[model samples]
Target: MEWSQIFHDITTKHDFKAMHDFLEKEYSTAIVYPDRENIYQAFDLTPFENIKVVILGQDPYHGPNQAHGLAFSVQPNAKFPPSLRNMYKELADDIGCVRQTPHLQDWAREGVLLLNTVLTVRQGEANSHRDIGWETFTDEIIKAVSDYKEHVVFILWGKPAQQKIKLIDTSKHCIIKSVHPSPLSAYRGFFGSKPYSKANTYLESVGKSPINWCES
Candidate 1:
């Protein structure tokens, strides 16, 4: 099914139109990360009905050859970003598996929706596009996931991702919260959070397939 039809609740919103227009204008004068075609890569990769886990990130990576749609994921050959490297460490520790590839498309294909709160960013600038309508769109996305799905897992890292907790129905979904995996914060709480195994445990308990987080 087309993503537009799948997420019609969000695509048909007035706020979505405004956000689309804003992004169209921004792309005219600014170089955006992830490219235009890849902005909705998360949704494209993981269909709504297939979604079993949601891992939310702040925004696209503000660097060259980074941010190919999935949050915290770069091109397969690209160097792993710091936060992704940290996540790999935690994944290895949690699941006793190793991930050699930086690309997370395999995870997405397995029903892990790696969504970024903000989809676009100006080159070399972090959070440059905040408060520009992406938040409104993503808020609706979160609400849709909460309202339409049950027994799903939400892995929210950092305060920004955790802020969306209100949109999720905890009674129906499992939520895992941790500090951001950036170098500055990983040591504080993210390193030992064991989100991968915890998420899989919840999935199996709920009669759903667990994600192979370390799949290459």
Candidate 2:
């Protein structure tokens, strides 16, 4: 499906129109990250109204066949990225078990919108599409979640993703802040941040079901 059609609610809104043309053209080319079918995977799993926990990732993984649009997620059979490995370690420590499948599609279905700050990347380069219009588009997504998803939990890992906290209204959501889950920084704080348990706790407080973090 076209991004404009998938995210029509946002595209027709004034805030996201500026990038409509750019996205249409950019995605039509040899985009390097997600396969076209998975580009809207996050939204497909958790449409706007169902968003309960938002896991904000910096960008799509740059490796071949690694990015499935949902942040920190990969195909069930794909190799684990360092960040995902660290996330698993923390998941194990926090909940006593790690999901058998590294793929986080289950979490998305449970209302976890695994969104990357930027949606696309070049084949071998990270953040290569930053200056394009992705951020402009994603920022509006964050704002929409903040404005409409009541009592949602936002687990913002790393500096780049955390920078979006300004877009959230604290009174309407829960915030879990920590270092990135990448090996380069996990030791600093991400390792035992307990984001999974914490997010579940917050969800329960709001009278919602806790996500089965151990489910794939």
Give the residue spans of candidate 1 off by over 4 A. 1-3
User: By summed lDDT, which 10 consecutive residues of candidate 2 come out lowest?
Assistant: 1-10
Pairs of colliding residues, candidate 2:
none
**Backbone clash count for every predicted candidate, in the order shown:** 0, 0
lDDT of 2 by residue, 123-208 (tens): 77877878676777788888878876678998999888889999999998999999988899989988778998999998889999
The lDDT, on a scale of 0 to 1, for candidate 2 is 0.82
Angstrom error of the Cα, residue 196, model 2: value is 1.0
User: What do the candidate models score in CA lDDT, each in turn?
Assistant: 0.89, 0.82
Q: What is the lDDT of residue 90 in candidate 1?
A: 93
Candidate 1 lDDT, 17-85, residue by residue in tens? 666788898889888887999999999899988999999988899888888889888998899889999
